[PDB]
Amino acid sequence: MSRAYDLVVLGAGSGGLEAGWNAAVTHKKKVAVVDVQATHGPPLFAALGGTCVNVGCVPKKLMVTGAQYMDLIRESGGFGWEMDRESLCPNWKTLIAAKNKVVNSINESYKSMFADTEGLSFHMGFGALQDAHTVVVRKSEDPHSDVLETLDTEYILIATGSWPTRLGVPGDEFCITSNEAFYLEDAPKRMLCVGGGYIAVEFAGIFNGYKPCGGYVDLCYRGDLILRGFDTEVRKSLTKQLGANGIRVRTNLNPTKITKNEDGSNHVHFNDGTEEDYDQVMLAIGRVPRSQALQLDKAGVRTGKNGAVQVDAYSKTSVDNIYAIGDVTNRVMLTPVAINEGAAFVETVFGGKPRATDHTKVACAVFSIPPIGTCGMTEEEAAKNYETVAVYASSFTPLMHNISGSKHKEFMIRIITNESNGEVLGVHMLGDSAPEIIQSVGICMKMGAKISDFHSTIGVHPTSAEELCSMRTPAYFYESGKRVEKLS
Amino acid sequence: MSRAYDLVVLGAGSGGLEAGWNAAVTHKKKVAVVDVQATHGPPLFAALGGTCVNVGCVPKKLMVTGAQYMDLIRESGGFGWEMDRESLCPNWKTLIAAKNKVVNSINESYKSMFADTEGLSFHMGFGALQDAHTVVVRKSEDPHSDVLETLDTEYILIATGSWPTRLGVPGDEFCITSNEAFYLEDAPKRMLCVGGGYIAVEFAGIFNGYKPCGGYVDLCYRGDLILRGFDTEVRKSLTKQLGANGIRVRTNLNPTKITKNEDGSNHVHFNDGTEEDYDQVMLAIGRVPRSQALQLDKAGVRTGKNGAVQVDAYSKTSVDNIYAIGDVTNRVMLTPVAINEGAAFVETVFGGKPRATDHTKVACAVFSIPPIGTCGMTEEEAAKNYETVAVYASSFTPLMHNISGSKHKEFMIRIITNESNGEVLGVHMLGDSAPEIIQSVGICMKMGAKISDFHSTIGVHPTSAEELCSMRTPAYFYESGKRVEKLS
Ligand SMILES: Cc1cc2nc3c(=O)[nH]c(=O)nc-3n(C[C@H](O)[C@H](O)[C@H](O)COP(=O)(O)OP(=O)(O)OC[C@H]3O[C@@H](n4cnc5c(N)ncnc54)[C@H](O)[C@@H]3O)c2cc1C
């Protein structure tokens, strides 16, 4: 059984690309990588690099940095930086323009990687499964399209990731998603972000920065508190700070109907039964795994709740040679996770020396206007399966914000510990420089640290991360899943 | 042997206060704290709070943040932030004035602490020693001054800290120091910073931000590479980045003569034998421990190199009941170290259960224009008293700086490891958010850490701190104090 390619990876995704690279360079296997298109695109959004390079973590990040400048400018005024506080206007155009110039060069970084690397080949189409060894390449997502290539391979790795979850309502097609968000010709005046997820909030922040005169940004959410899954004291405090930044939050509110007007703006009917007019409306409902058109059935790979490709703890699927990684798996959807799942796969099935991916004590971040950095268990979830738990709280407002006028940018820290052995189960932070600090916190937790480990370290005097080693006595306790003050 | 006070702390320093406070509240012992004045002051510089609150880290950091804005403003111009590129003018006055607003507020919250606390009292003057159990308070450093109080105590703690070193040359008195810098009437146009230490550099950054049109900021140094004591590759890259930021660095250069002009500026003669005119000239030569007035002799407490007070690792001096902490001890001098030495003291002699202070693997930071985060051993040092060592290096230029126009703000990391052990001995970083990241790095290293411990952790994707966990290949090695690439 000598086949054409040792591996065929579906998706140049941050997870897919990593795996395909690794196998061909360290292990010198023949690898073929399939993806939709060449560079970041308006008709098909993802491409060489993955969801995060083209329509995610990379371009998004730049836009959050750009919008963040709004505050910095007004703030500097308090430090003696005087100027015409109305010479100032944000040019959404020069942003997207300069954003595109950057993504483009990463796409042009990859193109040359492929022509420089022996064993790697990029094949452009729409991957589908014929059987366990044969991958078909089509020019359409439509199965009736043209047979462009047919690749015979020992292994198949699905890294197609995820895709916006639209909501089925009248006017659903009138909306935009995170995808079209990035290619909006002009900055929205009256803006509605819908939902309450990482992306809903990050983006709310962005439009709030690049809004023109009289512009505003509403954020509506089905539930009563945004960002379900984070420290419920961090969630509450962000809401305040977003409100104080200009983002009008609206909870327990969800549209039913959307219709276009004579000016071309979009009109919105609500859950409470009211109507408002927005230039634009973005859906951030979540992301269903992207296996819709792959025909896994045709080759026998078991899907689950909405196409989630079920895998073991080593990324293997229903078939002994087919694999899936990244977001399509439905485990925690992040770039550096997909990367790890990909690299572990490589060591396992090509390095001979197997390996599996640690899913807990993974630190992630929310690049909202005041960034969030968490790692570990929630306050609630640690109180569920752990017997005795301690809560350490500390909310301070840094020195500079007495001057900058933003006396609301209060930095927050929450530490959740197992009272029994003192172990640190979850750290949660709200404030600037939060995603930066939390990173090394995650090393400390996979290390297996304890609250003692923290305060027993000497700090750096003017930093905000020093207040991590300053929480000795706990704020309160959870004795077998109940709200407690004492213990005796 | 019942005495008036259990403790007399000789200096309301970072360490001074912490010590005094602790014993008075957690141990209810009677404490008296002696310092020079009440609020931050121009005639006598440090006051109730320490060399850090009044003429150190707290106000310093506010000014570094203000100078940081200059870049942030021009940088926003690339993100679409259009405005009058010359509406912008820094007002040095509104800064200093809003700086005092803050510092003064601290001094005001301290006053109220003393009135609020049973066992704590503030006594105002210049403390000297009468014997081992008697502290005298004078209204001058002059010993022929008036006896203002005389305190009968069981324990004395010397937290007088340190004091600027001037250099002995013609015109020495024409200069300013760390201290007077903070009260400069106006922003110095033609500016010279002298020496190559934390404050020499941090301050260089400050004036370079608040300089007015046409102004410049030179920096001269005796030696040929700035900041001896940090990673010799970080030291190089900073110099370059300062140069490119507007600061004219000059090595192997040291003034001899200073003479005032008939306009009011100061005139400078150099080591190379050249002449220049500067509006101001600030000395950042060093900080000699501040015991040169206390009469430790008349009590039997042994001074050393420049009055440094000799103490054991538990802070006890030549006498059984007298102690010294902070800068005056001449162990490496920072706020949180003085804080630890002071709290250790408390558990040691009042908590009953003794305690020592870990002086190594302390994470500190340099609040220069691009900040530095360092923790542990230098390259040159680990290459010495550790047999076989590895060097892990990685420099990247962050996502945003392709747009901001600062294609020179290259973030840098280098990790220093024991080969045999795998142990992480030193971590060094240059770039924005460095002091923040490094803090948790130091928790990891005191905890004992390995390069394998880093790359076994998953990352938070759009950060600079994530690049810590992506270093597997070493850049080169030190095989028993020798620069090598291979090993055998
Ligand atoms: C707006 C947004 C912001 C985000 N921000 C962050 C962040 O800040 N930090 C973070 O850690 N994560 C972030 N993420 C998540 C991150 O992008 C993903 O979790 C991660 O990139 C998933 O990688 P993957 O391996 O599944 O492949 P992906 O990176 O998702 O790429 C999948 C590839 O498969 C291709 N493909 C799709 N269908 C086919 C098919 N039919 N045939 C062949 N190829 C196909 C696509 O073209 C695409 O290139 C963000 C995501 C979004 C949407």
Ligand SMILES: Cc1cc2nc3c(=O)[nH]c(=O)nc-3n(C[C@H](O)[C@H](O)[C@H](O)COP(=O)(O)OP(=O)(O)OC[C@H]3O[C@@H](n4cnc5c(N)ncnc54)[C@H](O)[C@@H]3O)c2cc1C
């Ligand atoms: C400009 C500057 C910036 C700094 N920045 C940082 C930084 O960013 N991070 C960091 O970690 N460290 C920084 N430091 C160092 C830090 O401030 C000190 O290491 C720390 O304050 C030492 O504390 P201490 O316990 O020795 O007492 P100190 O805080 O030094 O205070 C000593 C007190 O004793 C009093 N005193 C002196 N003589 C007498 C006497 N005759 N009688 C009675 N009282 C007396 C003084 O008035 C003073 O209030 C900085 C220092 C300076 C000068």
Ligand SMILES: NC(=O)C1=CN([C@@H]2O[C@H](COP(=O)(O)OP(=O)(O)OC[C@H]3O[C@@H](n4cnc5c(N)ncnc54)[C@H](OP(=O)(O)O)[C@@H]3O)[C@@H](O)[C@H]2O)C=CC1
């Ligand atoms: N680390 C980062 O920076 C980022 C990570 N991601 C990852 O990628 C995935 C993409 O999800 P993204 O869109 O945030 O959203 P995720 O599902 O987190 O969030 C979805 C949000 O939409 C709400 N929602 C779901 N259905 C409806 C509905 N029918 N009507 C109204 N609201 C609804 C959900 O509410 P409810 O909680 O009540 O169900 C939830 O608040 C996430 O799982 C996340 O892990 C995405 C972006 C950035």
Ligand SMILES: NC(=O)C1=CN([C@@H]2O[C@H](COP(=O)(O)OP(=O)(O)OC[C@H]3O[C@@H](n4cnc5c(N)ncnc54)[C@H](OP(=O)(O)O)[C@@H]3O)[C@@H](O)[C@H]2O)C=CC1
């Ligand atoms: N962590 C932080 O953010 C900060 C910490 N500090 C601490 O407090 C102290 C303050 O530092 P500060 O005194 O700048 O500098 P520190 O002594 O580090 O450095 C002194 C600098 O002055 C130079 N120098 C000494 N003598 C002369 C001379 N005669 N002529 C010319 N140059 C000379 C030294 O050069 P050479 O190397 O040849 O001796 C050295 O570069 C340090 O001990 C530090 O630990 C201070 C500020 C901020």
Ligand SMILES: N[C@@H](CCC(=O)N[C@@H](CS)C(=O)NCC(=O)NCCCCNCCCNC(=O)CNC(=O)[C@H](CS)NC(=O)CC[C@H](N)C(=O)O)C(=O)O
């Ligand atoms: N500050 C720097 C370090 C630099 C520094 O200053 N270091 C040392 C000396 S070198 C130092 O001085 N450290 C102490 C310090 O800097 N403190 C600054 C804050 C002042 C002290 N803080 C007192 C307030 C304590 N807070 C609380 O007890 C919390 N709650 C409240 O104060 C009130 C009453 S419960 N309500 C609220 O907070 C909620 C009110 C709500 N917004 C509403 O609308 O109702 C930092 O944070 O990094």
Ligand SMILES: N[C@@H](CCC(=O)N[C@@H](CS)C(=O)NCC(=O)NCCCCNCCCNC(=O)CNC(=O)[C@H](CS)NC(=O)CC[C@H](N)C(=O)O)C(=O)O
């Ligand atoms: N970059 C983000 C993370 C986000 C991100 O981009 N993530 C992923 C995908 S989600 C990604 O795309 N990563 C790739 C990336 O960001 N790459 C940027 C670096 C590209 C690497 N380039 C390869 C070539 C090796 N380069 C070098 O070693 C650096 N320079 C040099 O070798 C040359 C020649 S010595 N010049 C210099 O070193 C400078 C010379 C000096 N200025 C002079 O005066 O001469 C971050 O780090 O914050």
